[PDB]
PDB file of all heavy atoms in Angstrom:
ATOM      1  N   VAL Z   1      -8.253 -25.089   9.385  1.00 15.89           N
ATOM      2  CA  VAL Z   1      -6.918 -25.700   9.105  1.00 15.89           C
ATOM      3  C   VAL Z   1      -6.082 -24.832   8.128  1.00 15.89           C
ATOM      4  O   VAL Z   1      -5.542 -25.352   7.128  1.00 15.89           O
ATOM      5  CB  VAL Z   1      -7.056 -27.144   8.505  1.00 15.89           C
ATOM      6  CG1 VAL Z   1      -7.436 -28.129   9.637  1.00 15.89           C
ATOM      7  CG2 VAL Z   1      -8.083 -27.145   7.383  1.00 15.89           C
ATOM      8  N   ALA Z   2      -6.130 -23.552   8.381  1.00 16.15           N
ATOM      9  CA  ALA Z   2      -5.416 -22.565   7.523  1.00 16.15           C
ATOM     10  C   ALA Z   2      -4.339 -21.831   8.358  1.00 16.15           C
ATOM     11  O   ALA Z   2      -4.530 -20.624   8.617  1.00 16.15           O
ATOM     12  CB  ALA Z   2      -6.327 -21.598   6.863  1.00 16.15           C
ATOM     13  N   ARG Z   3      -3.263 -22.529   8.648  1.00 19.05           N
ATOM     14  CA  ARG Z   3      -2.144 -21.889   9.449  1.00 19.05           C
ATOM     15  C   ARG Z   3      -1.078 -21.279   8.544  1.00 19.05           C
ATOM     16  O   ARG Z   3      -0.196 -20.559   8.915  1.00 19.05           O
ATOM     17  CB  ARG Z   3      -1.487 -22.915  10.366  1.00 19.05           C
ATOM     18  CG  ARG Z   3      -0.383 -22.356  11.147  1.00 19.05           C
ATOM     19  CD  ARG Z   3      -0.825 -21.024  11.901  1.00 19.05           C
ATOM     20  NE  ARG Z   3      -0.009 -20.909  13.080  1.00 19.05           N
ATOM     21  CZ  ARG Z   3      -0.111 -21.525  14.238  1.00 19.05           C
ATOM     22  NH1 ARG Z   3      -0.935 -22.504  14.296  1.00 19.05           N
ATOM     23  NH2 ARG Z   3       0.766 -21.248  15.361  1.00 19.05           N
ATOM     24  N   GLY Z   4      -1.224 -21.628   7.281  1.00 20.91           N
ATOM     25  CA  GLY Z   4      -0.312 -21.050   6.305  1.00 20.91           C
ATOM     26  C   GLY Z   4      -0.303 -19.553   6.217  1.00 20.91           C
ATOM     27  O   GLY Z   4       0.583 -18.952   5.705  1.00 20.91           O
ATOM     28  N   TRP Z   5      -1.320 -18.895   6.820  1.00 21.09           N
ATOM     29  CA  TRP Z   5      -1.416 -17.456   6.806  1.00 21.09           C
ATOM     30  C   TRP Z   5      -0.327 -16.889   7.765  1.00 21.09           C
ATOM     31  O   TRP Z   5       0.122 -15.781   7.332  1.00 21.09           O
ATOM     32  CB  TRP Z   5      -2.830 -17.147   7.308  1.00 21.09           C
ATOM     33  CG  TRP Z   5      -2.987 -17.281   8.802  1.00 21.09           C
ATOM     34  CD1 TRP Z   5      -2.900 -18.441   9.454  1.00 21.09           C
ATOM     35  CD2 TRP Z   5      -3.327 -16.274   9.698  1.00 21.09           C
ATOM     36  NE1 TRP Z   5      -3.121 -18.159  10.819  1.00 21.09           N
ATOM     37  CE2 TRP Z   5      -3.342 -16.851  10.986  1.00 21.09           C
ATOM     38  CE3 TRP Z   5      -3.574 -14.803   9.642  1.00 21.09           C
ATOM     39  CZ2 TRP Z   5      -3.680 -16.181  12.149  1.00 21.09           C
ATOM     40  CZ3 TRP Z   5      -3.778 -14.184  10.817  1.00 21.09           C
ATOM     41  CH2 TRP Z   5      -3.865 -14.791  12.007  1.00 21.09           C
ATOM     42  N   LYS Z   6      -0.071 -17.532   8.824  1.00 22.82           N
ATOM     43  CA  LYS Z   6       1.019 -17.048   9.738  1.00 22.82           C
ATOM     44  C   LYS Z   6       2.286 -17.137   9.181  1.00 22.82           C
ATOM     45  O   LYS Z   6       3.324 -16.582   9.564  1.00 22.82           O
ATOM     46  CB  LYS Z   6       0.840 -17.726  11.110  1.00 22.82           C
ATOM     47  CG  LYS Z   6       2.027 -17.552  12.000  1.00 22.82           C
ATOM     48  CD  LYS Z   6       3.113 -18.653  11.816  1.00 22.82           C
ATOM     49  CE  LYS Z   6       3.337 -19.271  13.084  1.00 22.82           C
ATOM     50  NZ  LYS Z   6       4.365 -18.485  13.969  1.00 22.82           N
ATOM     51  N   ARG Z   7       2.475 -18.095   8.173  1.00 20.85           N
ATOM     52  CA  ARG Z   7       3.839 -18.324   7.519  1.00 20.85           C
ATOM     53  C   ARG Z   7       4.311 -17.118   6.799  1.00 20.85           C
ATOM     54  O   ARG Z   7       5.127 -16.220   7.317  1.00 20.85           O
ATOM     55  CB  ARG Z   7       3.730 -19.509   6.556  1.00 20.85           C
ATOM     56  CG  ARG Z   7       3.947 -20.830   7.189  1.00 20.85           C
ATOM     57  CD  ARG Z   7       5.327 -20.869   7.766  1.00 20.85           C
ATOM     58  NE  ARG Z   7       6.075 -22.195   7.620  1.00 20.85           N
ATOM     59  CZ  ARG Z   7       6.453 -22.609   6.403  1.00 20.85           C
ATOM     60  NH1 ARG Z   7       6.347 -21.795   5.342  1.00 20.85           N
ATOM     61  NH2 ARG Z   7       7.044 -23.725   6.302  1.00 20.85           N
ATOM     62  N   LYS Z   8       3.812 -16.906   5.567  1.00 18.00           N
ATOM     63  CA  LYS Z   8       4.215 -15.784   4.805  1.00 18.00           C
ATOM     64  C   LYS Z   8       3.227 -14.649   4.974  1.00 18.00           C
ATOM     65  O   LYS Z   8       3.518 -13.612   5.639  1.00 18.00           O
ATOM     66  CB  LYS Z   8       4.395 -16.109   3.323  1.00 18.00           C
ATOM     67  CG  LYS Z   8       5.453 -17.247   3.088  1.00 18.00           C
ATOM     68  CD  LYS Z   8       5.407 -17.674   1.608  1.00 18.00           C
ATOM     69  CE  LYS Z   8       6.719 -18.384   1.324  1.00 18.00           C
ATOM     70  NZ  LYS Z   8       6.824 -19.728   1.978  1.00 18.00           N
ATOM     71  N   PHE Z  12      -3.675 -15.820   3.851  1.00 17.88           N
ATOM     72  CA  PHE Z  12      -3.903 -17.163   3.561  1.00 17.88           C
ATOM     73  C   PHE Z  12      -4.869 -17.855   4.600  1.00 17.88           C
ATOM     74  O   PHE Z  12      -4.985 -19.051   4.630  1.00 17.88           O
ATOM     75  CB  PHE Z  12      -2.579 -18.000   3.540  1.00 17.88           C
ATOM     76  CG  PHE Z  12      -2.334 -18.593   2.220  1.00 17.88           C
ATOM     77  CD1 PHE Z  12      -2.477 -17.881   1.072  1.00 17.88           C
ATOM     78  CD2 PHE Z  12      -1.948 -19.889   2.157  1.00 17.88           C
ATOM     79  CE1 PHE Z  12      -2.105 -18.524  -0.125  1.00 17.88           C
ATOM     80  CE2 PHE Z  12      -1.698 -20.549   0.962  1.00 17.88           C
ATOM     81  CZ  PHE Z  12      -1.834 -19.843  -0.217  1.00 17.88           C
ATOM     82  N   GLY Z  13      -5.521 -17.048   5.391  1.00 17.01           N
ATOM     83  CA  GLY Z  13      -6.449 -17.516   6.408  1.00 17.01           C
ATOM     84  C   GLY Z  13      -7.414 -18.456   5.781  1.00 17.01           C
ATOM     85  O   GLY Z  13      -8.010 -19.315   6.512  1.00 17.01           O
ATOM     86  N   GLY Z  15      -6.965 -20.490   2.596  1.00 15.77           N
ATOM     87  CA  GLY Z  15      -6.303 -21.688   2.230  1.00 15.77           C
ATOM     88  C   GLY Z  15      -5.527 -22.349   3.302  1.00 15.77           C
ATOM     89  O   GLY Z  15      -6.182 -23.193   3.951  1.00 15.77           O
ATOM     90  N   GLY Z  16      -4.318 -22.023   3.463  1.00 16.94           N
ATOM     91  CA  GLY Z  16      -3.577 -22.722   4.633  1.00 16.94           C
ATOM     92  C   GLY Z  16      -2.124 -23.113   4.132  1.00 16.94           C
ATOM     93  O   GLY Z  16      -2.024 -24.108   3.497  1.00 16.94           O
TER      94      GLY Z  16
END
Side-chain angles (χ1 to χ4, degrees):
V1 286
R3 178 51 154 288
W5 74 299
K6 166 267 236 281
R7 269 303 218 71
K8 300 171 159 77
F12 238 50

